[PDB]
């Protein structure tokens, strides 16, 4: 019932926003990526991928559909941003030269971030733009799949925010 709502909602939005990209995605794939952008879908899925809750059969299938769909989309080759707040001991591990890798999906956006004590600039090309699946195509979300590795190649504290620069290491 839920997956069909996701598929039909995402399909309507994509046909408005970029109908040709829509054809790259199966019903299962487009509904799964859309579901990742809902609170119920994201809160069930990403904490399991990050090892906080168990990755159950239904969640395994969910992840596979998301990543199969992202794999069809064209590369976003550029810089995107994540505004966030990291625990002190995690930020301490983000030293220049360090490596980072999220077991979950990492949401970023092409837009300049507003909130968070940390602003992460992300350079890569495994991220995929998924804004065409939203109703207004307005948030420029670029989604990195699980276990993308990044090297911390720069860091600076400017005003109250720690800026980090991640380079994807394929």
């Amino acid at each position: 019932e839920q997956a069909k709502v996701w598929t039909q909602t995402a399909r309507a939005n994509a046909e408005k926003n970029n109908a040709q990209l829509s054809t790259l995605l199966t019903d299962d794939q487009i509904g799964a990526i859309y579901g990742y952008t809902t609170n119920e879908g994201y809160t069930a899925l990403n904490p399991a991928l990050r090892g906080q809750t168990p990755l159950t059969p239904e969640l395994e299938a969910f992840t596979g559909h998301v990543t199969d769909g992202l794999n069809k989309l064209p590369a976003y080759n550029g810089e995107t941003y994540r505004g966030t707040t990291l625990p002190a001991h995690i930020l301490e591990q983000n030293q220049i030269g360090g490596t980072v890798s999220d077991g979950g999906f990492m949401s970023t956006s092409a837009k300049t971030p507003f909130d968070g004590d940390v602003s992460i600039s992300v350079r890569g090309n495994s991220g995929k733009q998924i804004d065409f699946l939203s109703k207004y195509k307005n948030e420029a979300e670029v989604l990195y799949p699980p276990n993308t590795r990044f090297e911390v190649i720069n860091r600076i504290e400017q005003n109250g925010t720690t800026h980090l620069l991640y380079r994807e290491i394929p």
Binding site: K16, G78, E79, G83, K111, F114, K137
Partner: protein, 365 residues
């Protein structure tokens, strides 16, 4: 600020413009939490579902015939700038100058003959007229008819196709309608901004559909994000102008989600640059900046076109982009009559602009 600088330098500099970025929805904000079960970040965002203020289309506060004159100005002005800018294409700045529609250039053209910039724009216009929406496959089919058969050419042949555009058409033919490519930064050329005007005319009543069609039309051949986002910004500039805004209003900073180099163009960083700080290269960012600069620094359509074309190097692309912006600002009725008279297929181009204008769908609600 030099837009060629690395994005680390630019993004630190751009922090003075954080107010130009729309706030996260509450859902996207949740996805940016370190732990979404223990949220840390302001929870005041709007639903992801909901229409943001920066997509509220400003109403057309000029008479319909005046807006039509600006829409005609945008598409005809594109062609006029193309026909004049090609004269100095590939030459070093200030070796030679151009002051009139004289033809020549690398393709040894007759006066009024335009090049691939206008060909691609006419393909886009015709695809809208036929489909009633942006249909990337139909757009690509029209480009292939131009490329392979000289349809929508000023002189009957395809003669100036860029390598990235050619690659896209060859790949579409080889791989079919699902192909998307040219993502790499070396493909962030001008081909999509120089053909943008038909999208902004057809979508004149909806910023959201302008936003959604502008990156999509780029993607028919160019999927570099700086091309896609430059088309979105140019598309909004043209929307504001076609709907009657002043130049000062159109060129003021707009809230919209843009990658940092287009964000800085939005922020107005070109306004006080001198000509020797402006680049007319094949890079989309240089060209967009140069065209905004040319319109900002002149007071009529004639002067805007010549200031762009005399930049040399890729004079064609900056002049075609300037022609769209200046044409929407000043209107078709303020383009020099001798240039309209010499411009090849001028009546056809005007009529396509008019067709797009009247077919423009109502805003969604």
């Amino acid at each position: 600020i030099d837009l060629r600088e690395d994005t680390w330098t630019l993004q630190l500099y751009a922090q003075r413009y954080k107010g130009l970025s729309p706030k996260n929805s509450r859902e996207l904000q949740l996805r940016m939490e370190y732990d979404p079960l223990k949220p840390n970040l302001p929870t005041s965002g709007e639903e992801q579902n909901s229409k943001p203020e920066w997509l509220n289309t400003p109403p057309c506060l000029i008479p319909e015939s005046e807006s039509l004159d600006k829409a005609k100005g945008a598409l005809v002005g594109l062609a006029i700038g193309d026909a004049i800018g090609t004269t100095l294409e590939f030459l070093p700045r200030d070796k030679l100058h151009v002051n009139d529609m004289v033809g020549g250039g690398p393709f040894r053209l007759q006066p009024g003959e335009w090049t691939d910039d206008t060909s691609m724009a006419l393909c886009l216009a015709e695809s809208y007229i036929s489909a009633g929406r942006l249909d990337i496959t139909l757009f690509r089919e029209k480009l292939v008819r131009w490329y392979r058969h000289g349809e929508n050419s000023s002189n009957g042949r395809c003669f100036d196709i860029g390598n990235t555009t050619r690659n896209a058409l060859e790949q579409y033919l080889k791989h079919g309608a699902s192909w998307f490519g040219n993502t790499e930064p070396e493909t962030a050329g001008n081909a999509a901004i120089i053909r943008q005007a038909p999208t902004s005319i057809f979508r004149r009543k909806s910023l959201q559909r302008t936003f959604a069609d502008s990156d999509s039309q780029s993607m028919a051949t160019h999927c570099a994000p700086e091309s896609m986002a430059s088309c979105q910004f140019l598309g909004f500039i043209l929307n504001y102008l076609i709907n009657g805004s002043s130049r000062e209003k159109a060129f003021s900073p707009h809230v919209m989600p843009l990658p940092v180099r287009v964000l800085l163009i939005n922020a107005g960083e070109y306004k006080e640059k001198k000509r020797d700080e402006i680049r007319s290269s094949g890079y989309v960012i240089d060209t967009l900046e140069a065209a905004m600069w040319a319109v900002w620094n002149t007071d009529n359509f004639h002067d805007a076109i010549l200031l762009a074309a005399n930049l040399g190097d890729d004079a064609d692309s900056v002049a075609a982009t300037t022609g769209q912006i200046a044409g929407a600002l000043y209107g078709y009725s303020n383009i020099p009559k001798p240039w309209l008279d010499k411009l090849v297929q001028q009546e056809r181009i005007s009529n396509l602009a008019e067709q797009l204008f009247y077919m423009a769908p109502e805003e969604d609600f």
